Amino acid sequence: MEPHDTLSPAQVDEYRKNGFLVQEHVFDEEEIELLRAEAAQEFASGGERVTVEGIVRGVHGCHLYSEVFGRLVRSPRLLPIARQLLRDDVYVHQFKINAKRAFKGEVWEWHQDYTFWHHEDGMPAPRALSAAIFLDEVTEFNGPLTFVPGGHGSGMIDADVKGEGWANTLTASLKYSLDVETMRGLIERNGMVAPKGPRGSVLWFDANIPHSSVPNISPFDRGLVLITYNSVENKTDVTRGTRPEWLAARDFTPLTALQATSF
Amino acid sequence: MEPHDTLSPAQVDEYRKNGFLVQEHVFDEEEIELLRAEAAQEFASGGERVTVEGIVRGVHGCHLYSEVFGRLVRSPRLLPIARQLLRDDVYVHQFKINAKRAFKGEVWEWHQDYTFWHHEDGMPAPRALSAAIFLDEVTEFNGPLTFVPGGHGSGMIDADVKGEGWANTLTASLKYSLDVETMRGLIERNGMVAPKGPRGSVLWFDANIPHSSVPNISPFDRGLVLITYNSVENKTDVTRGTRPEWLAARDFTPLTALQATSF
Ligand SMILES: O=C(O)[C@@H]1C[C@@H](O)CN1
Numbered sequence: 001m002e003p004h005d006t007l008s009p010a011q012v013d014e015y016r017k018n019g020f021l022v023q024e025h026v027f028d029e030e031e032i033e034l035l036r037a038e039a040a041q042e043f044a045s046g047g048e049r050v051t052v053e054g055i056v057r058g059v060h061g062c063h064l065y066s067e068v069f070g071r072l073v074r075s076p077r078l079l080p081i082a083r084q085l086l087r088d089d090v091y092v093h094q095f096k097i098n099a100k101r102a103f104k105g106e107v108w109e110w111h112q113d114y115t116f117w118h119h120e121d122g123m124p125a126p127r128a129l130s131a132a133i134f135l136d137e138v139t140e141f142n143g144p145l146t147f148v149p150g151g152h153g154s155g156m157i158d159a160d161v162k163g164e165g166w167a168n169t170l171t172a173s174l175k176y177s178l179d180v181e182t183m184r185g186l187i188e189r190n191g192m193v194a195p196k197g198p199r200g201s202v203l204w205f206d207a208n209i210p211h212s213s214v215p216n217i218s219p220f221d222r223g224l225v226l227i228t229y230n231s232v233e234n235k236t237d238v239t240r241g242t243r244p245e246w247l248a249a250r251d252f253t254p255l256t257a258l259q260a261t262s263f
Numbered sequence: 264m265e266p267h268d269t270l271s272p273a274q275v276d277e278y279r280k281n282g283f284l285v286q287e288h289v290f291d292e293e294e295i296e297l298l299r300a301e302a303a304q305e306f307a308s309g310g311e312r313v314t315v316e317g318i319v320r321g322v323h324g325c326h327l328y329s330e331v332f333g334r335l336v337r338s339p340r341l342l343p344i345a346r347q348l349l350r351d352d353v354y355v356h357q358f359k360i361n362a363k364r365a366f367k368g369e370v371w372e373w374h375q376d377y378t379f380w381h382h383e384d385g386m387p388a389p390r391a392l393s394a395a396i397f398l399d400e401v402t403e404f405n406g407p408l409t410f411v412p413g414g415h416g417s418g419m420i421d422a423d424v425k426g427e428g429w430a431n432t433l434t435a436s437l438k439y440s441l442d443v444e445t446m447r448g449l450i451e452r453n454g455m456v457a458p459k460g461p462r463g464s465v466l467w468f469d470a471n472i473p474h475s476s477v478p479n480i481s482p483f484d485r486g487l488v489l490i491t492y493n494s495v496e497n498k499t500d501v502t503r504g505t506r507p508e509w510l511a512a513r514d515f516t517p518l519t520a521l522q523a524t525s526f
Pocket residue numbers: 094112113116117169170
């Protein structure tokens with residue numbers, strides 16, 4: 001293992017100011033292909049953990065079931081940056097894989113992840129973030145995650161609620177959405193940015209940053225592996241929890257990094 | 264009237280190479296507001312010439328019914344550039360207004376306009392182009408027209424056909440679409456570009472350039488006034504024509520430019 005990676009002070013400042021940051025080329029092509037193959041296995045075998053638009057859209061919880069993905073979350077490319085940004089030991093709250101195949105895709109309601117994790121899972125504060133690993137180059141045209149830079153600084157934003165239980169936390173129509181109303185001011189104030197990057201990049205983003213994405217009109221897929229790390233001190237209150245382990249983790253053991261072994 | 268506008272030789276070369284070109288800030292804000300108000304009147308009063316996604320999407324043929332838009336097509340900002348690019352006297356084949364309101368919008372099938380005009384209207388060759396006037400700033404996020412640069416150089420491309428008559432020439436689901444198949448090669452060869460620009464710009468594009476667009480996830484509208492000029496020598500063969508005058512013109516009188524008057 002290479003000496004644990006960390007973000008420069010400029011990178012940190014950029015992440016805190018904007019609410020997101022791209023590191024290019026974290027993983028190589030061969031690494032990405034391993035992850036892609038495992039994702040395909042999880043989409044085939046994940047059963048109730050899968051979501052379909054038909055056509056698989058998402059699979060959840062894979063680090064609990066896949067040895068590859070259980071290792072990935074402890075990678076020296078990821079874990080030390082999460083600990084650096086959250087200023088704590090960390091654990092995985094949620095793991096999901098979101099594909100947008102060429103010429104497919106949904107419009108995804110503008111939203112803040114933390115609203116779901118607070119209300120559905122009992123997350124007490126937004127001291128969490130996600131790492132989105134680019135299984136394919138992310139361009140203007142294959143439905144990139146789209147943010148309001150600085151939009152997290154509001155904290156959590158009162159939001160239109162739709163549905164019962166949690167079924168529609170993972171779908172087209174999201175349970176907690178930001179209406180056109182609130183969005184206009186956000187965007188007049190702050191603008192919109194769809195970070196781009198090559199295959200193998202990682203996109204870090206704040207649990208409270210507003211985000212959205214459109215359809216992929218490209219002939220190329222947009223597969224993302226999203227790992228949500230949470231602060232151990234910020235562990236969710238499992239007595240207010242309403243979802244299964246494969247959406248909202250309950251094992252709060254602090255993660256340690258993978259070490260090099262001969263196998 | 265200012266001495267008729269024309270494109271520089273670099274601008275021409277760029278248009279011919281890419282198949283599109285943006286001129287920024289052709290019209291001013293006050294001019295644009297006049298056009299916006301007239302568009303709103305046409306959407307209210309156009310009847311069978313209107314198209315709805317509900318919610319108005321398009322209105323067609325307005326230069327035949329609106330004095331403002333009848334003048335616009337003869338504007339010294341537009342007509343002389345069309346004559347320059349088509350190397351002929353010109354007339355209006357088609358006029359349409361396409362709005363994408365904030366948070367609304369459709370995915371539009373990749374396609375070439377000339378395929379419709381050849382097969383539905385009897386246009387003998389692709390010696391035509393469109394001028395898209397930006398009634399609002401066009402950004403990454405409000406569903407900009409998206410092209411394959413150089414994609415017109417194929418000429419017309421064999422295309423999936425769907426429907427009877429012409430009803431679905433103006434809709435979500437288009438009669439002549441380019442499938443994922445053909446699109447992949449195009450885009451590997453040539454890439455994708457979504458020209459941007461401020462309100463009052465004009466986007467010129469070739470009758471044969473492939474194009475597509477996605478939904479507007481912005482809190483801002485994307486209104487476009489699209490004037491399709493055709494070469495008089497390239498006049499459509501009215502004996503193969505299948506659509507009304509307000510989609511496919513039959514008066515081939517060469518246009519002359521507006522001159523300054525006291526009223
Ligand atoms: O339900 C959740 O937990 C996640 C948060 C957002 O990505 C939407 N779905």
